[PDB]
């Protein structure tokens, strides 16, 4: 069943999969 989606969901090939951060994602993390 679907659950939260597929095994690789939410991991971007050009960012997370390369251990690279996008230019503004730190703004999100800092809010947490």
């Amino acid at each position: 069943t679907f659950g939260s989606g597929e095994a690789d969901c939410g991991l971007r090939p050009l960012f997370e999969k390369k251990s690279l951060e996008d230019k503004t994602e730190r703004e999100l993390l800092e809010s947490y």
Partner: protein
């Protein structure tokens, strides 16, 4: 998107564009949750006060696009719609409660560096991230300003726009509007006291409000751009369909209906 910036390439690889087929017109955003299922807002498809009732054959989606100022040959993909599911208790009469729909693709898309699905929140992500002040990220090709503005314009940008915005506490969402809010909605945006600006706008409906989990570093779609009053007004907040709340519907459609 108001007061956003141009997206980096591959930054939002779950972004989906919903077009009218005849003539070709960008209507709404959407998001990729598998190779063949796309989430959007119900009102992009069905809104009887405006005689809007689009069928599968009226629409098409484009996926993997970064700029409208180019056909991105070999990168962007298209599909026609096999089936539309509107939430059966979507409230178009009053307040767009349950502003959510699923679209199943006739041509499942191959994933690539530019095309990849987003997650739906589990209970733990919802509890931990859906808190006042925590920021999520909203994307779209909708209007840049509520009204035409000097040296900016109004309507649709070439490059996908992105803005990060904080979730706002429910009592402030409620007090900001005379429209009746429900638990299947949340609101986001800066308050007048915060100085920073930004919002979704017309044409961004159906696009995702995503948050990156600090626990597992995955992106989760928490909201769908649903509605507002104007765009980027002081003391007004964008409204989003609460994906977690509606997740059992999403799952039933995908798991059961075929």
């Amino acid at each position: 998107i108001v007061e956003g910036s141009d997206a980096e390439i591959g930054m939002s690889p779950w972004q989906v564009m919903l077009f009218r087929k005849s003539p070709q017109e960008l209507l709404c955003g959407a998001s990729l949750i598998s190779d063949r299922w796309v989430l959007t807002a119900a009102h992009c498809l069905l809104y009887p006060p405006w005689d809007k009732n689009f069928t599968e054959n009226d629409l098409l989606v484009r996926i993997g696009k970064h700029s409208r100022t180019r056909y991105e040959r070999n990168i962007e993909k298209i599909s026609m719609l096999e089936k539309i599911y509107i939430h059966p208790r979507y409230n178009w009469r009053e307040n767009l409660d349950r502003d959510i729909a699923l679209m199943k693709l006739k041509k499942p898309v191959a994933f690539s560096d530019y095309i990849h699905p987003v997650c739906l929140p589990d209970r733990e992500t919802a509890a931990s991230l859906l808190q006042a002040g925590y920021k999520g990220r909203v994307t779209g090709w909708g209007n840049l300003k509520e009204t035409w503005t000097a040296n900016v314009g109004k309507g649709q940008p070439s490059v996908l726009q992105v803005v990060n915005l904080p979730i706002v506490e429910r009592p402030v969402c409620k007090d900001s509007t005379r429209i009746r809010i429900t638990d299947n909605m949340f609101c986001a945006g800066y308050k007048p006291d915060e100085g920073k600006r930004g919002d979704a706008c017309e044409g961004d409906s159906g696009g995702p409000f995503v948050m990156k989990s600090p626990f597992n570093n995955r992106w989760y779609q928490m909201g769908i751009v649903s509605w507002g009053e104007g765009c980027d007004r002081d003391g007004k907040y964008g409204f989003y369909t609460h994906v977690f709340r509606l997740k059992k519907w999403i799952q039933k459609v995908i798991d059961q209906f075929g």
